Amino acid sequence: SHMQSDILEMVARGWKYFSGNFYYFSRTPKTWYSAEQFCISRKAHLTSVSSESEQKFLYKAADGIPHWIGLTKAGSEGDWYWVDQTSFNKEQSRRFWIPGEPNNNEHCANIRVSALKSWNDGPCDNTFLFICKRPYV
Amino acid sequence: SHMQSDILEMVARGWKYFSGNFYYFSRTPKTWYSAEQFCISRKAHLTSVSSESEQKFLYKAADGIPHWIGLTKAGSEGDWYWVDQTSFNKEQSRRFWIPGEPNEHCANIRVSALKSWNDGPCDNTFLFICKRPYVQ
Ligand SMILES: [Cl-]
Ligand SMILES: [Cl-]
Ligand SMILES: [Cl-]
């Protein structure tokens, strides 16, 4: 009810509700850095992917169009991490990377196929649609 | 004791220490967005400016070279604000904008003078300045 009217407010602002989080699928493309700053300006972050269930929601909604998510590599030689400061599960990510990815500039992940294995490692300065997440509180 | 080794640890990473804060003057240019994400990765933000003495420290060190700072407005129409969420003192700012000033809007320091802030497109590539408070 109060959750229901909060959902209605966010839906009118372009957000989708799923499993206790709000998601913003953008209408225009941005670099990974600019998209993260846009999500911050919306009290959000580029989305993390914490479960197979969340990955399935994201890839279906992304509809085979590249969408930035919030995983980035600390330069070409670092580990991958989530900008929202949840801990990255690199072992499960073997179920999410497109085979052969990360291909290994600056390195940023985007969802680009309508399958479970959908993450691509792409140059962070490419301009793609993007996906913010903000937990419902 | 630990205070001097704390300061020396950041200085050895390439930060300047000035009056209670660490500053990172970058070696490579970036867009404003990429510079802010770099500062975040170092537990920092693009610098705010909250006094005359801080403004003077920054413009002297910037040496007339454009440097991003942490002031922005969302679209040509929002109010200006500091990304580190400190309060923006509009009245004080009038002593820091270049005379005449102020799609994407981001401030950079670009003159070796007190009046040195420029309103520039966020997708320009400039050197930048991070700030991290010293907490003991
Ligand atoms: Cl958008
Ligand atoms: Cl950018
Ligand atoms: Cl640098």
Author numbering:
A (entry chain B): 188 to 291, 295 to 327
B (entry chain A): 188 to 289, 295 to 328
Give the original sentences from the paper that presented this experimental model.
Langerin, a member of the C-type lectin (CTL) superfamily, is a Ca2+-dependent carbohydrate-binding protein. This receptor is primarily expressed on Langerhans cells, antigen-presenting cells residing in the epidermis of the skin, where it plays a crucial role in various biological processes, in particular, in initiating the innate immune response. The canonical carbohydrate-binding site of CTLs features a long loop where the EPN (Glu-Pro-Asn) motif, responsible for its mannose specificity, is located. The recognition of the cofactor Ca2+ by langerin is tightly coupled to its life cycle as an endocytic and recycling receptor.
